[PDB]
């Protein structure tokens, strides 16, 4: 509802209980600048080159989660509000670049309507868990306060393979598997 | 607490015409509901929801706490934008990759891996800007600081047919053009 040339979300603190699950990030124009690893107390930049030009004191992220955790504790006791419903996540799989057989590419698994932000997004190549060449983003915020998150699988396009983005979430009564294959073409 | 609850806070900095204009909102969200918030335009903390009344007054009742918050528009927004952002975000320019491939057939122009989001793709048939039979996907956010967009042209390959995908992007000093002939 508020228009602009640019949106800088400087400070997003997400906290969940029970579990003391926290997430701190910085966004700009909808992309992730960095997230503060709450355990290692380290600012992790999504783009390595950006980290060499700018910096951020992971302490600020730690302070943020401190307050946010307190506030929650207050609200969880100051209200009789009923816990929001476990939304069912929705996944879409698409290639970062135009598929070309035998040419390295990246399968992207975009998962939306995630709530609460607790999920397992895994990849399967021929019904088998892929461990290497997989990267995941932080939980991005949505206007409706649910979240989205992307996972990436580095791969070599071949019609002999069938892939699967497997999503596990409390709001799904069974793991959802989004299939993809260059063979569909 | 035996039940799972989600609390969220965020500081949004809206820039327009650079820093020339800066609106600053702070939002406190609980269980998917925004309850209290600070808008730079309003000048102080407001109870977005009822559960927020206690807090709006409470924080507005602490001169420096409420005066540090109003200053964040300068401490954070203006400062982050005019400094760090100008060396990173505002100067990232990724040149879109452009390719044409077949799909009474359809031509698909894949415009990929570009940044920023701003882009204009156009099809030309014999130096003439084609507009009918054209359709584009929405802007696709790859989540890794790159976007992509696929533009299709429905057509009838008439011998002597020169179809050109025309892409204009800030990372490009000169518009990119890829051509495809019934021959190719």
């Amino acid at each position: 509802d508020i228009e602009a040339d640019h949106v800088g979300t400087y400070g997003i603190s997400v906290y969940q209980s029970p579990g003391d699950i926290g997430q701190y990030t910085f966004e700009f124009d909808g992309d992730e600048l960095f997230y503060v690893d709450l355990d290692k107390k380290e600012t992790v930049w999504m783009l390595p080159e950006f980290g060499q030009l700018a910096s951020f004191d992971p302490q600020g992220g730690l302070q943020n989660i401190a307050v946010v955790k307190h506030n929650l504790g207050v609200l969880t006791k100051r209200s009789n509000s009923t816990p929001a419903t476990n939304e069912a996540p929705q996944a879409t799989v698409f290639p970062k670049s135009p598929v070309l057989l035998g040419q390295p590419n990246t399968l992207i698994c975009f998962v939306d309507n995630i709530f609460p932000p607790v999920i397992n997004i895994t990849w399967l190549r021929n019904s088998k868990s892929v461990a290497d060449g997989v990267y995941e983003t932080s939980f991005f915020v949505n206007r409706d306060y649910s979240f989205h998150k992307l996972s990436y699988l580095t791969f070599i396009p071949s019609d002999d393979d069938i892939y699967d983005c497997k999503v596990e979430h409390w709001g799904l009564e069974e793991p959802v598997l989004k299939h993809w294959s260059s063979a569909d073409l | 607490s035996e039940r799972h609850f989600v609390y969220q806070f965020m500081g949004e900095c809206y820039f327009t015409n650079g820093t020339q204009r800066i609106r600053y909102v702070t939002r406190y969200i609980y269980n998917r509901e925004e309850y209290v918030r600070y808008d730079s335009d309003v000048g102080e903390h407001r109870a977005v929801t009822e559960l927020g009344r206690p807090d709006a007054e409470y924080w507005n009742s602490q001169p420096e706490i409420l005066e540090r918050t109003r200053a964040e528009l300068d401490t954070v927004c203006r400062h982050n934008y005019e400094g760090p952002e100008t060396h990173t975000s505002l100067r990232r320019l990724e040149q879109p990759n452009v390719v044409i491939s077949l799909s009474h057939n359809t031509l698909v122009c894949s415009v990929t891996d570009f940044y920023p989001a701003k882009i204009k793709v156009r099809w030309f048939r014999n130096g003439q800007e084609e507009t009918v039979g054209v359709s584009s996907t929405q802007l696709i956010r790859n989540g890794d600081w790159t976007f992509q967009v696929l533009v299709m042209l429905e057509m009838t390959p008439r011998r002597g047919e020169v179809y050109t995908c025309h892409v204009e992007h800030p990372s490009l000093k000169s518009p990119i053009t890829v051509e495809w002939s019934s021959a190719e």
Binding site: G60 | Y58, T75
Partner: peptide
């Protein structure tokens, strides 16, 4: 060298 980024500071609600 590096230009530091500052963040908003969430306020504490009384318990």
């Amino acid at each position: 060298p590096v230009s530091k980024m500052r963040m908003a500071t969430p306020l504490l609600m009384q318990a």
